[PDB]
From a paper:
Remarkable stealth activities exhibited by coronaviruses are facilitated by a series of non-structural proteins (Nsps), such as Nsp15, which is a uridine-specific endoribonuclease that mediates evasion of host detection of viral double-stranded RNA (dsRNA). Nsp15 limits the abundance and length of poly(U) within the negative strand RNA 5ʹ-extension by trimming down the initially synthesized poly(U) lead sequence to the optimal length that can suppress dsRNA formation but still serves as a template for poly(A) tail of the positive strand genome of the coronaviruses. Nsp15 C-terminal domain (CTD) belongs to a family of endoribonuclease with two conserved catalytic histidine residues (H234 and H249), which serve as general acid and general base, respectively, to attack the 3ʹ-phosphate of the target uridine. Cryogenic electron microscopy (cryoEM) revealed Nsp15 hexamer structures at 2.3–3.3 Å resolution at various functional states, including RNA-free and two dsRNA-bound states.
To understand the mechanism of poly(U) targeting by SARS-CoV-2 Nsp15, we reconstituted a ribonucleoprotein complex of Nsp15 and a 35-bp dsRNA substrate comprising the final 15-bp of 3ʹ-end of the SARS-CoV-2 genome and 20-bp poly(A/U) extension, which represents a coronavirus genome replication intermediate. To capture the RNA substrate bound to Nsp15 and trap the target uracil base at the nuclease active site, catalytically inactive mutant H234A was used for the reconstitution. The RNA-bound form was reconstructed as a homohexamer with clear A-form-like RNA duplex density and refined to 2.7 Å resolution. dsRNA density is diagonally attached to the outer periphery of the hexameric barrel and occupies a shallow groove between two subunits of the top trimer (defined as subunits A and B). The nuclease active site centers are located near the subunit interface between the neighboring subunits within the top or bottom trimers and the bound dsRNA fully shields the active site of the subunit A. One end of the dsRNA stretches along a groove between the CTD of subunit A and the middle domain (MD) of subunit B, extending upwards beyond the top trimer. Within the central region of the dsRNA, we observed unpaired bases: one base is flipped outside from the RNA duplex while its complementary counterpart remains orienting inwards within the duplex. U/A pair was modeled at this location and the flipped uracil is designated as U0. The local resolution of the bound RNA ranges between 2.4 Å and 4.0 Å with the highest resolution around the flipped U0 base. A total of 17 A/U base pairs were confidently built for the consensus Nsp15-RNA structure including the 10-bp preceding the flipped U0 and 6-bp following the U0.
Numbering used by the authors:
A (entry chain A), B (entry chain F), C (entry chain D), D (entry chain C), E (entry chain B): 1 to 346
The structure:
RNA sequence: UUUUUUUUUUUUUUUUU
RNA sequence: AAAAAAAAAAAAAAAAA
């Protein structure tokens, strides 16, 4: 019920299954409630769904730590079992359909129905009975905080999303063990690097090499870590000396530049992905690049990736498995040295 | 509940207080429900109220024969007790607020509360307990199908509105006795004429004089009923010889002209009122008047009204009480005969 | 392309695959095009889909005689192969998804993909290669104007829908052979009666018995056809003596009453179905019923159905296969004669 | 007039009653004006009112220091006399109706009419003649910058709202004397505490003990002010060790935690109230509480309140009058020391 | 095409003339594209134009450094030749019509057509062939990065707008030479000062005098630069002692105040102009002025302007050519010293 | 195959510095 | 010597057709 959902939102912050109703008015893709005689905005519809449907899906969103939407997209998750994963990047549900959540978006009441067999249903092992549901599911992805009997786990990212906040949990557990089944067979998930899902304005280093990068100059950091000949001066630090921006494909370099000279990052595809494309304009020098692909790889991981390459190649498309998906990089070596190594995904 | 109201609408045609819910989607001021997987329109909001509020009020509208909205407006009715009077002319509720109907529009749960004391509340005597409520009400209007002990009745119009259809009931009773209280005192409603609330394209005579008017010509009808000197050729029949349309202030004359030559009626204030103003354009001769006051009086009643006037006055404003309200007519006469007689101020 | 689709609409009335573009402006859920410098309305979106998606689907609607939407609904058709069936009752596409029509609504490019196997795909044998496509389909419905090798046909209704006009074709063939496959097995479609899909204001009899019903009085027609004891006075002709309308469950009776006393038909679920529920208000007597189940069976077929029943049962659920679906009727009889006969559950 | 209101907005920043007009276009709940041939957004309607009505009310808003909307709500104010109080928290007018401001929302021209008698009309003593209007008003609230002859004053909060900015005025007077009349009797307003209406990101201490709280650690501040046994470690400082966040019911503690590690405050009821409920998510540890009641009391005032309670009770509901309204707290104690103290019912 | 424009946006960040289409849905004045099965917002319309037209104009905007919109407005530019100048202040195209850009907004395909002759067409000398187009244009404005044969250049502002960012270019050239033709005659543009187009929260001094103003106190700066008698205590620094704010007509003084005490700036006309008018409310002292004219002149330039005035006049209107337009300053003096100096008509 | 594309360098052209 | 506008080239791919 719309009014029951609004009652739950106003009295508990989200849908908690409580009984009750409040006066609700819907106008201009917005849900209002009457508190002491005046209408108060409860929800503004930023989705393509009907305002009431999107409102009830938002109220019933998962408020526990959940995998980042990019991780679920890379695993081919099409739907979530008895829960709503909210995509805070898009301000919309991460999946078009639901299972036992919303009568308007439900394709089934349980993930065991025939309609859910072709779909990769996301199962949460923290919910009672969902591990057994995944065991019987033809296609699905299961996340657990611990071990599963008879199943080899895949250790995922250290961080997860909690109410739109990507964090490495201390009071709560955000590291999950990932399992996948395709056509009823448990797949072995490849060894992967994981993006750190950090922000430009609140960037915090997570390794000693990152601290050195943030505090040392270009020359000292490159000399200290023996990173000569891999074009770190352009790939990471960026070249703000021409009309077209050069490099800057690591968010750590973007944050380092933003610390001294804040710039603009136009996100023309506002979603959650392993590789993000930005229309970046440098407000200090005027350097701009219409498409700058930025990947939030740990600097140690990127160093290992770029040092694992073969430098004696004119040009090569390099496949790196990041966030459980194959990210293709455009290696551009020349005369035995790297000239450019940027993420080309998205 | 929105879903329960929609369930009642799809299973009973209107809100009947049944339990159950159906999936509902709201978009573009329209209520949809999903029948067999496809969205089906249930309600298009044509009011200034929020779409869900207007949908709930429309579903809970009175489906019994009710007084025409113009009658209630002339009686000063400000609100209805535990019911919704739907104004089908405006496709909106007849009153801004409700009593114990919709949480968003309610000012009280019962008409006995102090908020409803100053307002003139409409009480329906066919609903159990409403006569006693009207007895204790400070201001109110009561309609009953029969007599009320200690209250002298006021016989109202023969016709009443049934689901937007104005009809004289045969299988159902559409004639009510009207009782009004102002400041706790049972008022005496004046003796009034009543408009027939007929349509131009569905006009049906309700008297022998009207039949003769429709079938007999101008001169024959005027001579037969001794209507010389009252300017019936212009006031009722209408003048189409000049670019500015003359007379045509009775719906019977408009019906007679429409029978021979259809014209255009631009209702620039589409509401229910005793006197209606139209932008008439004659498609045959090109005669047009921007404001033409048309009143749907019985032809016998109008003849009696015009014959009860004093003809020895050049200009005189005639006050006629029609539909429980005083309608002002401007009477122009010369040489002891009527020259012009239409509702004044147009 | 939106502009190419609008170009096809303005130059051919619909999408014909022609090349060219016209200026298009979208505002207020409406598509406009610029003709001689002024904006002209091309399409108003009455669906729940985005205006551009609905416009593109409407342009690519099937303009050939197609089965009525109720027939495809009863056959369980979930999607159409490389065509759009437009539901003119709802002014919306008959199916939420498409196959190789609209990138926004397409789930596949061809009906053979794995996503279309669980669905019942509608195939039109008048399009080359669709019969073999149906032969390869796990679930599907095929209509043909002629015979199909190795398949036993099921003769459908004499009428079909042509641009929203339900007609029995003379210049074109509107009678189709129906074939159904469920889980790869050709099904034997049941022997069915077919509704005539006639209108109240444009009702035309299709049999001599219907002619007699329309012209003869109640008693003369009942005595002529030996229809005594089947309560034809109530079920078909209808009863308007009480405030609650009785009977009026056959569209021919509604048409006969409308011929003499026009009344209001409130379609509170405006969609295409074998049984239609109306909020009928008799404008002459005031009799009204909130839910009136009206089925447009041929009068001869309904007479055969009512005479094929066993009269010596108090209450019995009567199952009739109409329009390829089972319609359940309420049969109340007393003293070996019918008292009421209406579609159950209304 | 809409054009005159827009003229006043573009030439003076608000409605000043000047004469003149500017071109105005209304589209998508937005008011535009044409400046040198290009449309400029003047107002976006975030209210449930019509766009032009909300625009006129926003132009005619009070630009003088006015009491905070929570103070007026706690005093029972339903309407303001000849002025508009703008609720900047909701971006909407604080009251549904007006007195002599907007013809669309006016219920009267002057507060002396009968309709305003049952309502608690807000009067401003800084406007000439409103003190006498309050004297003759049945129900009303009067604010003055000085003394009123014969009326005992209630000193209000030091801060007031000035164009949506809450401040303690230096060049302007923001402290008002409050008077209330209920049913014609001048009420004695209770002695109350007042919330400081401070922000999280712009928190500024207003007392020495607040400064000590912000600079000193938990143990030092607790020991210095003899606050052992009042559970200040959880109530104010907050506990972030478990998944469910504990305490953090004073805005000063939230500000202290924000100064070190920023977190997210989801205000699911964005209005002005003495007690605010937030969906709190700690971005550093992962602690989260769906509903966290935060009250912005002076730390000295809160310490006095907590020291005025009786500690020898297991569970007790504490009634504290704050911002002219009774705020209820749960007081849980064990072994003669406080275990929990939060506003009741959250 | 809408789909091609969206494909260009998602693949290159802007319209680059690529071939290809993506699925697009338009709803609620917003453009969405489907990426991996979920709708992603691409553009939200804040213009008065249709959503698709505004989306096409925004995608085809100029992404190279361009003159600020105020400069083009002061030059009388009505339209741009084969390009879209985006007004990021209004989030709308700077000009109503286009030339060979969008079919819905085009008045011509080339600037040589007769319709463009009366209009001042903006030409970009960096685009090939536009200098010759300006040479044959009746009315136009040409900007070049270098010399033009036979034409005397007018050196413009050092800064330009790049993707909505105003900057003095280092990697790009932001200083242009301005040429204007009126009725086919090359005009000599007046010698003018230029506003620095700085922001309050990101103010950076561009001269030694500005540095001294920001660091030194008011008295020290006034004494050092011999600025006694020019009322710099009010005009630049501002007065906050009274309820009405005094002076504060230079953005540098507003920035100095914002550094020590952040306040509110209500931009009630959000557009680009040489003189900006703000509703400034001081959060610390409570001083507010409904309309405050603020001009972003270099402090050295303003000092030269105020020292070039004739002090022996009581009231005098000063005409200053700033940003190629004549800004009217109101000068009040007493006893041979400046009392007040603000742009007139506020 | 075709056409277009890809946040590398390289020439060639061209203006303007 | 640049710079930028306009081409082409080396290379690995991505489509679609």
């Amino acid at each position: 019920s719309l009014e029951n959902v609004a009652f739950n939102v106003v009295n508990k912050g989200h849908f908690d299954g409580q009984q009750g109703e409040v006066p609700v008015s819907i106008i201009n893709n917005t849900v209002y409630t009457k508190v002491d005689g005046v209408d108060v905005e409860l929800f503004e519809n930023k989705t393509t769904l009907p305002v009431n449907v999107a409102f009830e899906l938002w109220a019933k969103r998962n408020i526990k730590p959940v995998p980042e939407v990019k991780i679920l997209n890379n695993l081919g998750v099409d739907i979530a079992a008895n829960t709503v994963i909210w995509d805070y990047k898009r301000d919309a549900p991460a999946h078009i359909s639901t299972i036992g959540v919303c009568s308007m978006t439900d394709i089934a009441k349980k993930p065991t129905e025939t309609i859910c067999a072709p779909l990769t249903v996301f199962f949460d092992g923290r919910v009672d009975g969902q591990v057994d549901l995944f065991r019987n599911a033809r296609n699905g992805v299961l996340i657990t905080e611990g071990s599963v009997k008879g199943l080899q786990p895949s250790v995922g990212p250290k961080q997860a999303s909690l109410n739109g906040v990507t964090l490495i949990g201390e009071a709560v557990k955000t590291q999950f063990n990932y399992y996948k089944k395709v056509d009823g067979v448990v797949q072995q998930l490849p060894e992967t690097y994981f993006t750190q899902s950090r922000n430009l304005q609140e960037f915090k280093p997570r390794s000693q090499m990152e601290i050195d990068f943030l505090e040392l100059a270009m020359d000292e950091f490159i000399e200290r870590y023996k990173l000569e000949g891999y074009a770190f001066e352009a790939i990471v630090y960026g070249d703000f000396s021409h009309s077209q921006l050069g490099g800057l494909h690591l968010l750590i370099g973007l944050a380092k530049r933003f610390k001294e000279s804040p710039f603009e990052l136009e996100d023309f595809i506002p979603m959650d992905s392993t590789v993000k494309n930005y229309f970046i304009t440098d407000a200090q020098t005027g350097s701009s690049k219409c498409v700058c692909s930025v990947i939030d790889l740990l600097l140690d991981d990127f160093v290992e990736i770029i040092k694992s390459q073969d430098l004696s190649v004119v040009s090569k498309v390099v496949k790196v498995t990041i966030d459980y998906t194959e990210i293709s990089f455009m290696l551009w070596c020349k005369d035995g040295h790297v000239e450019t190594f940027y993420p080309k995904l998205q």
